[PDB]
Design an enzyme around this catalytic site. Structure first.
Site, PDB file in Angstrom:
ATOM      1  N   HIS A 138       0.796  -1.220   0.000  1.00 40.36           N
ATOM      2  CA  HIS A 138       0.000   0.000   0.000  1.00 40.36           C
ATOM      3  C   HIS A 138       0.838   1.286   0.000  1.00 40.36           C
ATOM      4  O   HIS A 138       1.474   1.604   0.995  1.00 40.36           O
ATOM      5  CB  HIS A 138      -0.899   0.002   1.219  1.00 40.36           C
ATOM      6  N   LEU A 139       0.823   2.046  -1.085  1.00 37.95           N
ATOM      7  CA  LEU A 139       1.603   3.288  -1.167  1.00 37.95           C
ATOM      8  C   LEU A 139       1.759   4.092   0.121  1.00 37.95           C
ATOM      9  O   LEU A 139       2.876   4.425   0.527  1.00 37.95           O
ATOM     10  CB  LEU A 139       1.034   4.206  -2.231  1.00 37.95           C
TER      11      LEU A 139
ATOM     12  N   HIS B  60      -5.222   4.608  -1.604  1.00 39.34           N
ATOM     13  CA  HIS B  60      -6.564   5.162  -1.432  1.00 39.34           C
ATOM     14  C   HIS B  60      -6.593   6.567  -1.931  1.00 39.34           C
ATOM     15  O   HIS B  60      -7.592   7.254  -1.778  1.00 39.34           O
ATOM     16  CB  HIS B  60      -6.940   5.254   0.038  1.00 39.34           C
TER      17      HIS B  60
ATOM     18  N   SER C  13     -18.977  -0.177   7.610  1.00 43.95           N
ATOM     19  CA  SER C  13     -17.710  -0.865   7.805  1.00 43.95           C
ATOM     20  C   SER C  13     -16.802  -0.129   8.791  1.00 43.95           C
ATOM     21  O   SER C  13     -16.091  -0.752   9.605  1.00 43.95           O
ATOM     22  CB  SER C  13     -17.011  -0.979   6.456  1.00 43.95           C
TER      23      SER C  13
ATOM     24  N   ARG D  10     -17.894  -0.687  12.424  1.00 44.65           N
ATOM     25  CA  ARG D  10     -17.423  -1.996  12.883  1.00 44.65           C
ATOM     26  C   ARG D  10     -15.938  -1.961  13.166  1.00 44.65           C
ATOM     27  O   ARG D  10     -15.485  -2.529  14.156  1.00 44.65           O
ATOM     28  CB  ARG D  10     -17.673  -3.081  11.840  1.00 44.65           C
TER      29      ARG D  10
ATOM     30  N   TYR E 138     -16.964  -4.744  -5.107  1.00 48.00           N
ATOM     31  CA  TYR E 138     -16.853  -5.573  -3.922  1.00 48.00           C
ATOM     32  C   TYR E 138     -17.909  -6.636  -3.998  1.00 48.00           C
ATOM     33  O   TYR E 138     -17.615  -7.815  -3.859  1.00 48.00           O
ATOM     34  CB  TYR E 138     -17.075  -4.750  -2.662  1.00 48.00           C
TER      35      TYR E 138
ATOM     36  N   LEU F 136     -12.810 -15.197   4.202  1.00 44.52           N
ATOM     37  CA  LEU F 136     -13.322 -14.685   5.482  1.00 44.52           C
ATOM     38  C   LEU F 136     -12.737 -15.377   6.769  1.00 44.52           C
ATOM     39  O   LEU F 136     -12.122 -14.732   7.628  1.00 44.52           O
ATOM     40  CB  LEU F 136     -14.864 -14.810   5.443  1.00 44.52           C
TER      41      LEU F 136
HETATM   42  N1  LIG Z   1     -11.751 -12.442   2.948  1.00 40.85           N
HETATM   43  C1  LIG Z   1     -12.757 -11.520   2.906  1.00 40.85           C
HETATM   44  N2  LIG Z   1     -13.940 -11.747   2.265  1.00 40.85           N
HETATM   45  C2  LIG Z   1     -14.932 -10.823   2.230  1.00 40.85           C
HETATM   46  N3  LIG Z   1     -14.836  -9.603   2.804  1.00 40.85           N
HETATM   47  C3  LIG Z   1     -13.699  -9.234   3.485  1.00 40.85           C
HETATM   48  C4  LIG Z   1     -12.581 -10.205   3.569  1.00 40.85           C
HETATM   49  N4  LIG Z   1     -11.597  -9.603   4.274  1.00 40.85           N
HETATM   50  C5  LIG Z   1     -12.009  -8.353   4.619  1.00 40.85           C
HETATM   51  N5  LIG Z   1     -13.264  -8.124   4.153  1.00 40.85           N
HETATM   52  C6  LIG Z   1     -14.047  -6.865   4.363  1.00 40.85           C
HETATM   53  O1  LIG Z   1     -13.563  -5.692   3.673  1.00 40.85           O
HETATM   54  C7  LIG Z   1     -13.951  -4.531   4.421  1.00 40.85           C
HETATM   55  C8  LIG Z   1     -12.729  -3.715   4.739  1.00 40.85           C
HETATM   56  O2  LIG Z   1     -12.248  -3.133   3.539  1.00 40.85           O
HETATM   57  P1  LIG Z   1     -10.716  -2.601   3.494  1.00 40.85           P
HETATM   58  O3  LIG Z   1      -9.909  -3.876   3.656  1.00 40.85           O
HETATM   59  O4  LIG Z   1     -10.463  -1.980   2.143  1.00 40.85           O
HETATM   60  O5  LIG Z   1     -10.701  -1.625   4.691  1.00 40.85           O
HETATM   61  C9  LIG Z   1     -14.578  -5.059   5.697  1.00 40.85           C
HETATM   62  O6  LIG Z   1     -15.954  -5.262   5.400  1.00 40.85           O
HETATM   63  P2  LIG Z   1     -17.114  -5.294   6.508  1.00 40.85           P
HETATM   64  O7  LIG Z   1     -16.466  -4.551   7.679  1.00 40.85           O
HETATM   65  O8  LIG Z   1     -18.299  -4.608   5.838  1.00 40.85           O
HETATM   66  O9  LIG Z   1     -17.415  -6.767   6.758  1.00 40.85           O
HETATM   67  C10 LIG Z   1     -13.937  -6.416   5.806  1.00 40.85           C
HETATM   68  O10 LIG Z   1     -14.588  -7.314   6.699  1.00 40.85           O
END
Ligand SMILES: Nc1ncnc2c1ncn2[C@@H]1O[C@H](COP(=O)(O)O)[C@@H](OP(=O)(O)O)[C@H]1O
Lengths: 7, 253, 242
Positions: free
Chosen positions: B42-43, B66, B97, B100, B162, B197
């Site tokens: 990530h830059l 980003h 998100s 959370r 996504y 996940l």
């Molecule tokens: N293996 C996976 N499969 C599906 N979603 C994933 C994942 N790993 C991370 N995410 C989700 O990607 C979001 C975070 O994005 P980023 O990584 O760009 O910050 C979070 O979504 P949620 O918090 O809505 O579940 C995170 O849970």
């Protein structure tokens, strides 16, 4: 990563 | 032209696309959380350390960011950029998100409304100090898609949602891999299985247990906090701002 | 080329140098904290926002940094860098400085100890999360002075101790101004007066000792370092910090 704050 | 970006707005699923992308190239899983950062750096993270990939390399390079495409720092890769994968997610869900990720349980309306309302006023995460240089949601999207040639006159764009990815992980990772010419396809099914996940949560914990540099847990819809906020989002969604224009286009209306 | 750096390890009084410099270039006082970043921007600050001045820009440009000259990101300025000012201070004071900042009231034994323990093991702020890419104290100095040409082949270097600035603000500031070719000397007076300890703490807010205490063992620890075989002792000696 590489993210800000301050928490 | 051998530089390639996985551009995305915060919370679009970047780590996951990032994680599956590494798995496919390495050929084996990703056993540890900074493997992600090792894989598709990530830059922003590279700059924190004063690191920066070579401007103009001979063989293909993959970075994530980003940043809006137009941010000056990227001016350095203006000609070396060949390919953009723009990862996009429902803005309703990106907003959820962050709640959370911030901890915050779905009861604390005060706590959630504040983020929600700030999110609506700003058309994205601009007030959240976790990231900088991202712009508003549509701003980001415009710069990588509709405007990409203002920043990288030589680039070609794939867009990927996504939600498409959750529905068809292997089919969708394949579009991205075919686009970037990373090769095969029998590799694809495997990469998905590795960055599930489940795999991801455990992979986060194991890192976290080996006191490791990780990004407090990291891994629904509108009714619950609102009416006031439901209408507020709706109005933004179906209004006449560029946000609306993009929300309509990627099918989030 | 036309690029100029105010390079310094963290806590070496870089803010103040910048403040004063901003005040001379502008003539006017510094209207407050962000003024400093607008004038002599700190590079880390810019990259966080995605901001980064262009390589080979045709008029003189001043930036600040805590990076070691050899960090890959400074590579873009490899050729176009002409001038480096390297600001150096007693690493004894830098350390004591992090403490006041990190909050601690000097009689918090195990709290001071630990940071001090760490600073000495690291030879600088490697284990301190606030900064990154700054390297260790000797490493930082080395790369911006004796080894500057390995990073910035066309650069000239003016090294400058924080303690000399404190002893003669206008004399030392003008040595920096002169070296950078920002003009006169007359300006140099007001600029010092425009960024004094008072105007400073006021600009911070309307925006938003020694090793004696607990020493016995630590004092020793430090002094062993300061008269060690290492690059930390080399520069301590060379800058009068020993
Ligand atoms: N293996 C996976 N499969 C599906 N979603 C994933 C994942 N790993 C991370 N995410 C989700 O990607 C979001 C975070 O994005 P980023 O990584 O760009 O910050 C979070 O979504 P949620 O918090 O809505 O579940 C995170 O849970």
């Amino acid at each position: 990563x590489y993210x800000x704050x301050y928490x | 032209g051998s530089m390639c970006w996985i551009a995305s707005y915060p919370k679009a699923g970047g780590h996951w696309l990032r994680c599956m992308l590494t798995s496919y190239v390495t050929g084996e899983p990703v056993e540890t959380w900074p493997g992600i950062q090792a894989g598709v750096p990530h830059l922003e993270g590279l700059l924190r350390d004063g690191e920066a990939p070579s401007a103009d390399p001979d063989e293909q390079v993959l970075l994530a960011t980003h940043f809006t495409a137009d941010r000056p720092v990227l001016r350095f890769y203006r000609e070396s950029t060949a390919k953009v994968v723009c990862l996009i997610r429902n803005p309703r869900d990106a907003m959820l998100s962050l709640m959370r990720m911030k901890g915050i349980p779905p009861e604390d309306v005060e706590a959630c409304r504040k983020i929600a309302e700030t999110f609506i006023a700003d058309e994205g995460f601009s007030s959240v100090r976790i990231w900088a240089g991202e712009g508003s949601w549509p701003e980001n999207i415009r710069s990588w898609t509709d405007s990409v040639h203002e920043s990288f006159p030589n680039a070609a764009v794939l867009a990927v949602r996504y939600e498409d990815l959750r529905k068809d992980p292997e089919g969708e990772l394949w579009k991205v891999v075919d686009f970037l010419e990373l090769g095969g396809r029998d590799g694809v099914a495997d990469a998905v299985a590795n960055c599930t996940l489940e795999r991801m949560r455990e992979m986060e914990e194991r890192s976290k247990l080996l006191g490791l540099e990780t990004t407090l847990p990291f891994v629904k819809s509108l009714k619950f906090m609102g009416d006031d906020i439901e209408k507020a989002y709706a109005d933004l969604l179906h209004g006449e701002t560029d946000f609306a224009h993009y929300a309509r286009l990627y099918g989030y209306a």
